[PDB]
């Protein structure tokens, strides 16, 4: 079916633009559908922005006015948003969507891309392994994490052993403090397969290019 | 602008039992060609939109018939005959018929399940963050129901509020539970200066909170 996926900077300086792009897969943009750019404010509130439709055709919200434009790029079958004038009122996740312009129906949505509208510095993350203590080490099941921190902006990508892990994970929402954000993931393994089967914590942070791969070591003697 | 009003704004709903929401505009949706442009989407924890029902009434692409929709004019109602965990999520109303386009605030459907009391772990600072003078110490408090739950941090049995952030997750589909993480952030100078630290967790399955301390310098 038609698959599409936003890419575009997630971090942009007050009052200047924010700029999107959407590639749309297994299926031609001059066919059938009116390709939409919808954003989700931080409480959970969607707004229309507006759209494109096959035949080049736009429409945004007036709640917008002049600051947006849509457009698109049919030899690379792709739509665009551009955002100008921003400020911290913009910081939300941006979605591209594909709705028949018959019926609404088909309705396709992007990954989202997280945007920040900020003039804070982009900041690496240091990755802290978390070793459970020796007393909680004598049960069934073992609980082991990881402590990413001080990082800006969002976001990161967090899995353990290269995502061959994923069974007993718990990755809690970054809570941000001074412009850097800090966010924890928890992992759960049978206590008689730690540390035989060692446990990574593989952390990314696209905005500064940087890769962290922490092996969890227990405490004590290693 | 057309308001899309829905309610309730949260449900609690059994594993198997029906759900039913509504969503009521302020015009009517009907357009010139006898078509409705109402759909309804879901939006599951970290996921984006999905598509349920489009038309007012009816299903879309590869949608289970487990969902429903229905109405006209300006009331528009959504059932689900029988609740899976995995149903679990935000749901939506849009309508497509005024321009410009609108969205309704959202119905939060929670899954309801036995009580079930929280695991607690308690993590000390890493050794490479107490090079950096920095020093935090991790709690987790994981798969529990229902929702509410708190967490006290004490320093060598003196409590401390200070420095404390926290994080929930969103219920999890997998088993129906919430989870919480509870980091407490000091100096690396007054962390060595203290010995203990207590991480403790009150919720309804208990009538005594859970208990977990290490001391510092000690496996």
């Known amino acids: 079916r038609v698959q599409l996926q936003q890419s575009g900077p997630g971090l942009v300086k007050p009052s200047q633009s924010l700029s999107l792009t959407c590639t749309v897969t297994?299926?031609?943009?001059?066919?059938?559908?009116?390709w939409n750019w919808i954003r989700q404010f931080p409480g959970n509130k969607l707004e229309w922005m507006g759209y494109?439709?096959?035949?080049?055709?736009?429409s945004h919200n007036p709640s917008l006015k002049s600051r947006i434009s849509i457009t698109r790029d049919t030899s690379k079958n792709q739509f665009f948003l551009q955002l100008n004038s921003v400020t911290t009122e913009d910081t939300a996740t941006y979605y591209c969507?594909?709705?028949?312009?018959?019926?609404?129906?088909?309705?396709?949505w992007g990954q989202g891309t997280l945007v920040t509208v900020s003039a804070a510095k982009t900041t690496a993350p240091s990755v802290y392994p978390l070793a459970p203590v020796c007393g909680d080490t004598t049960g069934s099941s073992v609980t082991l994490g990881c402590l990413v921190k001080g990082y800006f902006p969002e976001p990161v990508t967090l899995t353990w052993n290269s995502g061959s892990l994923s069974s007993g994970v718990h990755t809690f929402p970054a809570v941000l403090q001074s412009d850097l954000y800090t966010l924890s993931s928890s992992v759960t393994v049978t206590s008689s397969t730690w540390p035989s089967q060692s446990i990574t914590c593989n952390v990314a942070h696209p905005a500064s290019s940087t890769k962290v791969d922490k092996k969890i070591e227990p405490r004590g003697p290693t | 602008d057309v308001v899309m009003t829905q309610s309730p704004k949260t449900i609690s709903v059994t594993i198997g039992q029906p759900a039913s929401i509504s969503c009521k505009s302020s015009?009517?949706?009907?357009?010139?060609?006898?078509?409705?442009?109402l759909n309804w989407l879901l939006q599951r924890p970290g996921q984006s939109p999905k598509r349920l029902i489009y038309?007012?009434?009816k299903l879309d692409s590869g949608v289970p018939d487990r969902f429903t929709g229905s109405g006209s004019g300006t009331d528009f109602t959504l059932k689900i005959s029988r609740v899976e965990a995995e149903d679990l999520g935000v749901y939506y109303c849009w309508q497509g018929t005024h321009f410009p386009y609108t969205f309704g605030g959202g119905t939060k459907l929670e899954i309801k399940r036995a009580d079930a009391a929280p695991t607690v772990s308690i993590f000390p600072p890493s050794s490479e963050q107490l090079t950096s003078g920095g020093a935090s110490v991790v709690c987790f408090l994981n798969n529990f129901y229902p929702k509410d739950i708190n967490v006290k941090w004490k320093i060598d049995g003196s409590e401390r509020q200070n420095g404390v952030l926290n994080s929930w997750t969103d219920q999890d589909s997998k088993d129906s539970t919430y989870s919480m993480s509870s980091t407490l952030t000091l100096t690396k100078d007054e962390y060595e200066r203290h010995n203990s630290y207590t991480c403790e967790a009150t919720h309804k399955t208990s009538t005594s909170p859970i208990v977990k301390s290490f001391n510092r310098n000690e496996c």
């Open positions: 494109i439709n096959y035949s080049g055709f736009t």
């Open positions: 015009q009517r949706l009907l357009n010139s060609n006898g078509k409705t442009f």
């Open positions: 038309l007012g009434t």
């Open positions: 297994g299926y031609s943009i001059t066919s059938d559908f009116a």
């Open positions: 969507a594909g709705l028949l312009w018959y019926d609404g129906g088909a309705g396709s």
